[PDB]
């Protein structure tokens, strides 16, 4: 009694693909009989996404309802996954099991091997990444504040500064490492590694704080730096 | 001279969206002119998706590659953003902003206000949180293990414990928090909050455990416990 697993590979966002799992030693049409899919995230742990039972009742994870359909071919005697509308979010190993509803007892059995799904449509060249320091601080009103962030790459001077109100659009308030937005008050100076300086700290001041290079696509932010009052 | 938004809200995963980007002061055919939506998970930083210029030039960030689009209408002066193929990673506040490549200078500026879209097929209720403890634990060969797992509500004895090891796909150990799997060795047992105890540490019996509640669906499994060697 063994389940064999066929599919899975490289795929693009957005497209479909289609998972097999031969059923051997047993049949699909048997009573009690259910097949499931699980799968795991690489270096995480597992998810339950469906379950087909041998009386057409199913049952989905929410997130793949409306894109992953499970299904069993008796003549072959193979249970199907059909994934489309695939994201990113998708990238894991994917395994078949052997469900048996035949009062108390329900477990996943005689796993099949799995195989990697990975939903991706880039190079193996890695994306700019930026650091922000530090990722929280804490002031009062008229001190001085200075927020770092660093680039993987030498980016040159293609940095902006944003800030960010809770519940509000972000804001520039320097492109180009230095150069200040018009409107925004000249405590606010940029400077290069990467520094925005706030040299008096004002009540509106107290916000979310955002880095990003426009020298490559994709542009890339810094993860924040909210600075929080004392 | 700002932009107005428009669009979001609650869509089923695999759905379909549009967001408008109405441009109020400017003109987005003008030369220089360029258009971009960039997104915030809830609780998250700033992540760029796209950009389109006056010359129709355009960049995509990879996992939005084949399922969005971005575009502008000139009658109405919006841009806009098809959003296909949604997945509950695209669950974010998504803004739009103004791009002017007009030779250092290229900034997102006089943001849209922002508006939330939720990927999701779910009800209110929360899904049965599975906590195993501890997440990693250190033995040697011979030792006694107690690894302990606890359900988020009453799931009475409805609870299967797994082992998998390195690249190997998960193996029943216990069904229905007692009962061991036939042909697994009986220094394994389950008990009852729930625990899975090995009397005696084997060399084969270094690897991760997962416990899993089959009372309701989803089936829920806990976040691991790797034993690995002193």
């Known amino acids: 009694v063994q389940l064999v697993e066929s599919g899975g590979g490289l795929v693009q966002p957005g497209g479909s693909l289609r998972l097999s799992c031969?059923?051997?030693?047993?049949?699909?049409?048997?009573?009690?009989?259910?097949?499931?899919?699980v799968r795991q995230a690489p270096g995480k742990g597992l998810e339950w996404?469906?379950?087909?039972?041998?009386?057409?009742?199913?049952?989905?994870?929410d997130s793949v309802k409306g894109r992953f359909t499970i299904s069993a071919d008796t003549s072959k005697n193979t249970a199907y996954l059909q994934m489309n509308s695939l994201c990113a979010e998708d990238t894991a190993v994917?395994?078949?099991?052997?469900?048996?509803?035949?009062?108390?007892?329900?477990?996943?059995?005689?796993?099949?091997?799995g195989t990697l799904v990975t939903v991706s449509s880039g190079g193996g060249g890695s994306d700019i990444q930026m650091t922000q320091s530090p990722s929280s601080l804490s002031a009062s009103v008229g001190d001085r504040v200075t927020i770092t962030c660093r680039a993987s790459?030498?980016?040159?001077?293609?940095l902006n500064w944003y800030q960010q109100k809770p519940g509000k659009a972000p804001k520039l308030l320097i492109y180009?490492?230095?150069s200040l937005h018009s409107g925004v008050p000249s405590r606010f100076s940029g400077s290069r590694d990467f520094t925005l300086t706030i040299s008096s700290l004002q009540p509106e001041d107290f916000a979310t704080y955002y880095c990003?290079?426009?020298?490559?696509?994709?542009?890339?932010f810094g993860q924040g730096t909210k600075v929080e009052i004392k | 001279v700002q932009l107005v938004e428009s669009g979001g809200g609650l869509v089923q995963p695999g759905g379909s969206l549009r967001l408008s980007c109405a441009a109020s002061?400017?003109?987005?055919?003008?030369?220089?002119?360029?258009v971009t939506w960039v997104r915030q998970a809830p609780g998250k930083g700033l992540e760029w998706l796209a950009t389109?210029?006056?010359?129709?030039?355009?960049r995509y960030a990879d996992s939005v590659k084949g399922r969005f689009t971005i575009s502008a209408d000139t009658s109405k002066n919006t841009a806009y953003l098809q959003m296909n193929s949604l997945c509950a990673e695209d669950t974010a506040v998504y803004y739009c902003?103004?791009?002017?490549?007009?030779?250092?200078?290229?900034?997102?500026?006089?943001w849209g206000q922002g508006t939330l879209v939720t990927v999701s097929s779910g009800g209110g209720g929360s899904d049965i949180q599975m906590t195993q403890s501890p997440s990693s634990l250190s033995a040697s060969v011979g030792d006694r293990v107690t690894i302990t797992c606890?359900?988020?509500?009453?799931?009475?004895?409805?609870?299967?414990?797994y082992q998998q090891k390195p690249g190997k796909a998960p193996k029943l150990?216990?069904?229905?928090?007692?009962?061991?799997?036939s042909g697994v060795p009986s220094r394994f047992s389950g008990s009852r909050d729930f625990t899975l105890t090995i009397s005696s540490l084997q060399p084969e019996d270094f690897a991760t455990?997962?416990?899993?509640?089959?009372?309701?669906?989803?089936?829920?499994?806990?976040?691991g416990t790797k034993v690995e060697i002193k």
């Open positions: 389109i210029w006056w010359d129709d030039d355009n």
């Open positions: 002061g400017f003109s987005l055919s003008t030369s220089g002119i360029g």
């Open positions: 902003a103004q791009s002017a490549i007009t030779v250092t200078d290229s900034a997102m500026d006089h």
């Open positions: 790459q030498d980016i040159s001077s293609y």
């Open positions: 180009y490492t230095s």
């Open positions: 990003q290079q426009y020298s490559k696509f994709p542009w890339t």
